[PDB]
């Protein structure tokens with residue numbers, strides 16, 4: 001399942017570098033990461049209040065808290081329209097949570113969070129993603 005692997009590589013590396021502040025299909029992945037670095041940080045900067053309010057309401061302190069997020073992520077992501085904008089918001093909130101997790105020394109929860117967001121995205125919408133040319137469509141879309 002190469003789309004799952006490529007989606008996990010991009011989302012994992014984005015969340016990890018947002019948390020740590022430090023950088024680590026080859027071509028697409030690096031272009032897709034570069035785009036998140038641009039659109040993702042814009043989303044977080046622009047929606048800091050809603051993100052912080054949501055995170056405080058979710059009360060995320062440990063691996064059990066993070067593992068219980070998948071349902072609400074699937075409900076909210078599936079509830080609305082599929083477009084790259086809503087995909088980026090999902091990944092941006094993930095990054096915002098990864099940062100919180102690093103702050104409170106729960107950095108070991110960042111990987112299951114990235115796997116959880118990848119499962120949401122690839123398991124609700126792999127057809128749409130295939131039709132859009134997967135990560136190629138994302139890079140063309142955003143530049």
Ligand SMILES: COc1ccccc1C[C@@H](Oc1ncnc2sc(-c3cccc(Cl)c3)c(-c3ccc(OCCN4CCN(C)CC4)c(Cl)c3C)c12)C(=O)O
Nearest residue numbers: 047050051053054069072073076077080086087089090093
């Ligand atoms: C540009 O769109 C933004 C930007 C900032 C916040 C909300 C949205 C709507 C967007 O949200 C999402 N789009 C795609 N995937 C997801 S997944 C998700 C979510 C929802 C709950 C839990 C978890 Cl783990 C994830 C939200 C999403 C959904 C709603 C949200 O906030 C709604 C406003 N509240 C008002 C009360 N206040 C205390 C907290 C903020 C937020 Cl912050 C998010 C991240 C969301 C979309 O649905 O297109």
Ligand SMILES: [Cl-]
Nearest residue numbers: 137140141142
């Ligand atoms: Cl296009």
